[PDB]
């Protein structure tokens, strides 16, 4: 809470400089060689790391470290400005660490890609870094609300070749940005729509349903003549099925195609006339088709338009839609600022099993005076603090109990926060094929022998009794 308040105020007080002298922003960059013996506006810090058995790594309490992924340049005017204004977060980092000496990490994900964590430690050691703070599960949890996503893949003849491979990879990467609270189904349509996999209505994005969808997408072949009015009339109908369980909010449609001629006004006027379903249109591949109807489709219905001409753009274009989804919660005001705890997952910096509390940081530039609200509808980032499962285990002593006795905790989804059977290993998703990022989610019924009484007990604990 206090970190978010300070970050909001510091952003409110910032001035958008453009001319940066060679030494105006000072930071560590958390990825530089400690012994270079040697930039456009930045001056590096040579810090001192001694040791800390609480982390196992070598850390510095004097300042925070900044991680900037490989793709994003660190000399851009959009990155230098944040590297300047986020420098005020170090004082609050130190204050929190001195008030509670048991704090492990205090990360501030940013909408541009950089992450600032207080204990200055070098990043994880072809060793190329594909880490992006805007795709981690805690950031995704804290940047939007549970979704009802229905990916609509174009499988006509024209998407054959490179376009099909790019579409498959993009769909897989989009599926990777989904939590257990999110429900997703993947459909396809050349001339008549059909479900890509055995699922027919909607499935929650577990680690297994996602693999099923990914395999079914990778089995897709392209043949036929595009018919938008039969694919959208199918997507909107599977978004109306209420016999099954769903997140029941943020009903969004993903259209993966190349380009066309039909805008299908009748289908939208028939199904979505009050505009309760968002539409995101993707123009995948390198071609010269008419990218006109899909932009209008993403404009008339709430949504945004993306272009994926290569493998590099896949990650950013698939991750960007959270920025669009985040507008209602920031417009809600100081009511969406609720701390949410993620599922148990292996820490990126190798602390083992942890859970992160997430608080969104809103844009309050010109809040006092009602002048500017156009760009205030996008989040600045997500704050995050990590608590290790070792702390929760220490809060529950077991040596007064018999060895057969133990403690366990259940979240609403039914996964175990604490359990003796739970181990720091990724969940097995299937038989290993011949020739850490995923959350560790183990159900209560999958950690012990399933019994009739243990299901009723699980339901009662989920209800909160």
């Amino acid at each position: 809470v206090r970190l978010a308040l300070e970050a909001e105020k510091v952003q409110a007080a910032h001035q958008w400089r453009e001319d940066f002298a060679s030494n105006e922003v000072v930071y560590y960059n958390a990825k530089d060689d400690l012994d270079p013996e040697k930039e456009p506006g930045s001056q590096r810090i040579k810090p001192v790391f001694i040791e800390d058995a609480n982390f196992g790594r070598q850390i510095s309490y004097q300042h925070a470290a900044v991680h900037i992924p490989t793709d994003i340049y660190e000399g851009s005017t959009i990155v230098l400005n944040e590297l300047n204004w986020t420098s005020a977060l170090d004082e609050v980092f130190k204050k929190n660490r001195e008030e509670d000496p048991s704090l492990l990490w205090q990360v501030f994900g940013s909408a541009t890609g950089l992450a600032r964590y207080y204990p200055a430690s070098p990043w994880v050691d072809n060793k190329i870094d594909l880490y992006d703070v805007r795709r981690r599960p805690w950031y995704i949890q804290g940047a939007a609300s549970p979704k009802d996503m229905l990916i609509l893949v174009d499988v006509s003849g024209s998407v054959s070749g490179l376009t099909l491979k790019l579409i498959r990879t993009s769909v897989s990467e989009m599926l990777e940005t989904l939590s257990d609270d999110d429900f997703v189904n993947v459909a396809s349509f050349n001339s008549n729509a059909q479900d890509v996999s055995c699922f027919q209505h909607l499935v929650q994005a577990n680690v297994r349903n996602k693999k099923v969808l990914k395999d079914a997408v990778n089995n897709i072949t392209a043949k036929g003549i595009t018919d938008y009015k039969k694919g959208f009339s199918f997507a909107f109908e599977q978004l109306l099925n209420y016999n099954v369980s769903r997140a029941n909010c943020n009903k969004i449609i993903m259209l993966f195609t190349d380009g066309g001629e039909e805008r299908a006004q009748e289908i939208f006027n028939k199904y979505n006339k009050d505009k309760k379903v968002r539409v995101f249109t993707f123009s995948v591949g390198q071609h010269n088709y008419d990218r006109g109807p899909i932009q209008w489709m993403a404009c008339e219905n709430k949504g945004y338009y993306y272009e994926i001409p290569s493998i590099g753009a896949i990650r950013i274009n698939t991750q960007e839609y959270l920025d669009v989804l985040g507008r209602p919660m920031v417009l809600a005001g100081d009511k969406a600022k609720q701390v949410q705890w993620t599922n148990v997952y292996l820490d990126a910096l190798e602390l083992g099993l942890v859970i992160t509390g997430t608080l969104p940081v809103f844009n309050i530039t010109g809040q006092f005076e009602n002048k500017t609200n156009l760009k205030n509808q996008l989040i600045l980032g997500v704050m995050g603090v990590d608590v290790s499962l070792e702390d929760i285990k220490r809060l529950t002593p077991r040596f007064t109990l018999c060895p057969n006795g133990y403690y366990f905790a259940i979240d609403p989804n039914g996964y175990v926060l604490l359990h003796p059977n739970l181990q720091p290993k990724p969940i097995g998703v299937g038989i290993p094929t011949i020739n850490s990022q995923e959350p560790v989610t183990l159900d209560f019924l999958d950690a012990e022998l399933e019994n009739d009484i243990k299901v009723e007990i699980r339901n009662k604990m989920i209800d909160g009794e």
Binding site: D71, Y73, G75, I128, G312
Partner: protein, 241 residues
């Protein structure tokens, strides 16, 4: 001539070059004697049939004087200037040409080649004028538009800094972004003339066509299929020249 073909370019201190140096001394001495005797007979004071009236004599003088000057410079301290002795060594290649005058039939072929040059001179002037016009037009159309980036996703120069991920088959490699110019461009009249000569010879002109049809604007990265109408320029060039 045979000795010039046996030197080792790679290793200056090779055992064969040391031996060939003395052959060079002997040949230079023989040529000095031949030149000095020809000077004695022909003379220097405006005899109107003297040495320096016929071009071949000037060529022989250049060869021998270059040899002697090269021997002179290495007289003391060779490390001061090595390019100087290198160029004078390169000057030795004119020895094969010293047989055109000495073989009457070879001179009768060289004169035929010269007449062939003389007959087509005016058409050559017209050809150069037309190619100059085409080069100027190409400069106007494609001036500064032949800039690209190592990362294709970045259009401008300011964006092409840092590192980008090169997604190769089965391996992902991190490389640097560079704002490079194309190998054959149209920046001034000389570059345009060179590029048009390369196109006329037929080598690599499809790449030039692709670069021309992908040219968007000055100081901006290419966009595929932007201006496909530029193919008419290269069609007309091929039809004409």
């Amino acid at each position: 001539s045979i000795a010039l073909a046996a030197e080792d370019p790679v290793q200056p201190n090779a055992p064969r070059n040391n031996v060939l140096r003395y052959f060079d001394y002997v040949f230079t001495g023989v040529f000095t004697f031949e030149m000095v005797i020809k000077m004695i007979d022909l003379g220097l004071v405006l005899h109107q049939g003297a040495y320096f009236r016929d071009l071949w004599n000037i060529l022989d003088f250049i060869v021998v004087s270059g040899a002697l000057v090269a021997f002179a410079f290495t007289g003391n301290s060779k490390g001061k200037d090595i390019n100087t002795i290198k160029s004078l060594r390169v000057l030795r290649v004119l020895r094969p040409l010293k047989t055109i005058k000495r073989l009457p039939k070879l001179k009768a072929v060289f004169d035929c080649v010269v007449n062939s040059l003389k007959n087509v001179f005016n058409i050559l002037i017209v050809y150069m004028l037309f190619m100059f016009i085409f080069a100027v037009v190409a400069v106007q159309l494609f001036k500064g538009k032949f800039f690209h980036c190592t990362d294709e996703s970045k259009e401008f120069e300011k964006d092409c800094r840092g590192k980008y991920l090169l997604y190769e088959k089965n391996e992902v490699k991190a490389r640097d972004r560079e704002w490079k110019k194309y190998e054959f461009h149209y920046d001034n009249v000389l570059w345009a003339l060179l590029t048009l000569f390369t196109v006329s010879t037929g080598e690599g002109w499809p790449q030039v066509l692709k670069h021309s049809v992908d040219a968007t604007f000055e100081n901006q990265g290419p966009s595929p299929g932007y201006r496909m109408e530029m193919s008419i320029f290269y069609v007309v060039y091929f039809v004409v020249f």
